[model samples]
Target chain A: EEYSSNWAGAVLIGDGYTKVTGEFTVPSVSAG
Target chain B: EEYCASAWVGIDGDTCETAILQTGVDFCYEDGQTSYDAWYEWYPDYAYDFSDITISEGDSIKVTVEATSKSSGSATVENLTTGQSVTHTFSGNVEGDLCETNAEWIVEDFESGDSLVAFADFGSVTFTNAEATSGGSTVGPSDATVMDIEQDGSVLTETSVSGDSVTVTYV
Candidate 1:
């Protein structure tokens, strides 16, 4: 079995151009 | 829990460079890693430079985020996947170069972490944003995206670039 979803969020930086393209891992598909 | 996705920065040299990414990207995720390929999009509205990214064969990726706290003003590179996040506190550590040596290594050994599987490279030293507490998002120069490419193996399969936004699908 496999599970996944959509993740989104906004950020406000102090200085310089700020972009948030952080990474997420694949949570193992548990043993059913 | 919400859906999770991430975009990586590739250098022009095709050195398998990891996105020293801190700003200029927004998008969504198609969360799942089965026999099927994982899918997502990258929307870097603006950036210092809009160079294209490069990749290799059978490449797999895992994303890690460093979210700053609103209150007390702290920043943490949380391992959202397993909930093993790393938070760092900033007091008087702010100097001229925040992303340099002064930039605390909150993540003890993320690249070397046994659990973080994949052939991903983690070597972007200049974090630009080092203060976990004072770390917040800010806008900068808006430029056009040059090369948006998609790939599954070592070859770049597809590409799409609309001014500043780029979406690449794995082949």
Candidate 2:
């Protein structure tokens, strides 16, 4: 799989918000 | 070669495109070594690294961004596993004013020196406790739009939302 050379990523978006929070466990990453 | 990815929770940067208040961790792999950094940004400014926190694989990371106003905000990144946190506050006179028109949870192949870095196989990132404050009410991602990474005719990730959580997986 190839990713965009500018700003590729998975994004979740919704109507305007004043604050946002989330928690995630760091994942091990390697060169594709 | 080096590959990189960033996971963040932020406000704006979508429909607004004017400004974004965001904080998160960046993962990089180079020369057979993996490194991590915690950073915050109010774009269109460059991201700044938080020198006070340490990050490692499997660490529980919590990120929060709050918009005090269209041009001012605060961002916080907590290494829950390490019990360390860092906060950055942006005041008025920022380069771009926010629309507060979008809230997002993203796993990005971010740009550096004017180009996106190599994409990384970031196993997976699941953002739990995902919620936002909209019109003085708390909201989840259940109604949010799901976007995957695609380039050169290939999709590199899969994203989904379930209740208050959002998950992104490398394909």
Candidate 3:
């Protein structure tokens, strides 16, 4: 979908779907 | 070889290297639902789970690991082979109409202690529907801030636009 197949989801490694790493990005609390 | 490694903006996973979708909440129509909006029919695309893509050393002539957001937490880019992790830390408040400020992003090369600070905020990028920018130049490891994080609010705005339209967003 997005970065690492799981753009907004989770990601794994290998055909067995082994979990490799966990990444999180904080959505900006913008001021309008 | 791709987003998980390089050229990740709006780019599809597995397009270059196989990867997993971390946020089913954001990518799926609803949690485990298979149906997709127009751009992301690939959801739950994997038969079982998201997989890590392996690439030949030559495949990665240049690689980039990016964090997108007005405020990305701290990230450490590590070289699997060297066991080296670069801590690209970004911390700050997020706010504004113009987004003149409130963005903090840093990219570091764990191999080296070199680090840098910059205001890089693409704000947001849409999922499935399509991508905003296709690719970005690679940051050479020698320069230290080899991992460049361009933080801005526009990215957030784009994410809010498309995401909110469908009530979804990407990290």
Candidate 4:
């Protein structure tokens, strides 16, 4: 799921359910 | 130049506590070859392939992932328009914190060799029935940040979510 976008250059579009009542922090990962 | 397009719901976290249970609509054109299929990924492993299914424009695909516990779950990918479905069940026994940290709806630009593939026009991808559980409550797409993907300070794609549906277009 992660590497496909990071290494494979695939575009992703997603939506659905979520319950982020806790503090939401953007997860960080370096790019190519 | 080449490119691939996909739509999926996934989760990420620290160390092995991280796992991605996803059902995806994958379309790719690489090295002058094009292929389309429904893809499934369970983090940190080779993704499974079902080439018998074709993913095309205007098709309604549904990907459903459920966590029965912090250590057990299942995911199902269905071609709503084609009436085909594939399900994968898993155990989080040692994966730890299946509730991890974050969840997402993403559009990815896969790499070709060592380089990011050239951007391609995916027309559009819509994600619906999007939901996630945090603190024992189910939340919808609006609960998460919705924005375009940026590469090198330039926007690589655009996204919008209304109700439980999210649509992304590669521009």
Candidates arranged by lDDT, highest first: 2, 4, 1, 3
- Residues B124-158 of candidate 3 have per-residue lDDT tens digits of 32222211111232211121111122234222111
lDDT of 4 by residue, B104-153 (tens): 66666655567666656666665656666665667666645555656665
Interface RMSD for each predicted structure: 15.4, 3.0, 18.3, 10.5
At residue B130, what lDDT does model 4 achieve? 60
Model 1, runs deviating above 4 Å: A1-15, A23-32, B1-76, B87-144, B148-155, B161-166
Better of 1 and 2 by lDDT: 2
Per-structure clash totals for the candidates: 27, 0, 31, 25
Could you list the CA RMSD of all candidates, in the order they appear? 15.4, 2.4, 20.5, 8.0
TM-score of chain A of each: 0.20, 0.44, 0.20, 0.17
Report the error of model 4 at residue B145, Å.
1.5
The worst-scoring run of ten residues by lDDT in candidate 1 chain B lies at B100-109
| Candidate 2 residue pairs that clash | none
Candidate 3 has an lDDT of 0.21
List model 1 lDDT by residue over B66-169, tens digit each.
32221112232333334443323323222211221111111111122343122222111112222222225322112222232222334221233332223333
Stretches of candidate 2 exceeding 4 Å from the true structure: A1-16
**Candidate 4 overall lDDT versus native:** 0.54
TM-scores of all predicted structures: 0.26, 0.92, 0.19, 0.70
- Model 4 chain B poorest ten-residue lDDT run: B12-21
1 or 4, greater by TM-score: 4
Name the 10 consecutive residues with the lowest summed lDDT in model 3 chain B.
B96-105
Evaluate every candidate with DockQ and list the scores: 0.07, 0.53, 0.03, 0.08
Q: Under the 3 Å rule for N, CA and C atoms, how many clashes does model 3 have?
A: 31
